[model samples]
Target: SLSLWQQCLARLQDELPATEFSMWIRPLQAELSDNTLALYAPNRFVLDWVRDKYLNNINGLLTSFCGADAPQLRFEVGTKPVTQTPQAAVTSNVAAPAQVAQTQPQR
Candidate 1:
């Protein structure tokens, strides 16, 4: 099942430009509790920008999706929980030099 935030994500991704969505909205992490949706941003700038720019749009999305059950939005500077290591795929594809056999006279 998709979370409420994910539902909003789909709508926003479809409605907004890819560059704008990826730059601003992609980094937010959502948490829901007690009918409150907390949106955690990686930094102060992101938090402020989101609050100033997208808060109303997000709230409208929630309202449209959930109606009375819509969770209130909250923006904070934080990070998502670290679940998996990002170094899972480390590919080293370097071609080895072909061996060259050379005969040398030893003194």
Candidate 2:
């Protein structure tokens, strides 16, 4: 999510009550798809509540980033499922150096 969710949280943190935001938003887990982004809630009721209440704000942010290319939004329940894109993999695992360490000369 490229810290995009963090940005959303920054806005959400200000807009919502601390308890409300933390209770609902903090536990959310993001999932990426070809044309969608899902935010997982803890359960069915919580998913509905947050969707009913705060989805507009989240959608607004999504719109700003995606514009015409906006991905879909889904809210569900479960632990966060982290994903690894090719770019993410490239950044996370750097190629190692080929050369061995040079011997240090005694002073």
Model 1's lDDT to the true fold? 0.72
- 45-79: candidate 2 lDDT, tens digit per residue: 87887776567766777778768875566878787
**TM, every model:** 0.59, 0.55
Q: Residue-wise lDDT of candidate 1 within 74-99, one digit each (tens)?
A: 87788545675555555566676788
Show model 2 residue runs off by greater than 4 Å: 14-19, 79-107
**Top lDDT prediction, candidate number:** 1
| Cα RMSD for candidates in order | 16.4, 18.9
Instruction: Give candidate 2's TM-score.
Output: 0.55
Provide the overall lDDT of each model, using Cα atoms, as 2-decimal numbers: 0.72, 0.69
**Residue 77 alpha-carbon offset, candidate 1, angstroms:** 1.4
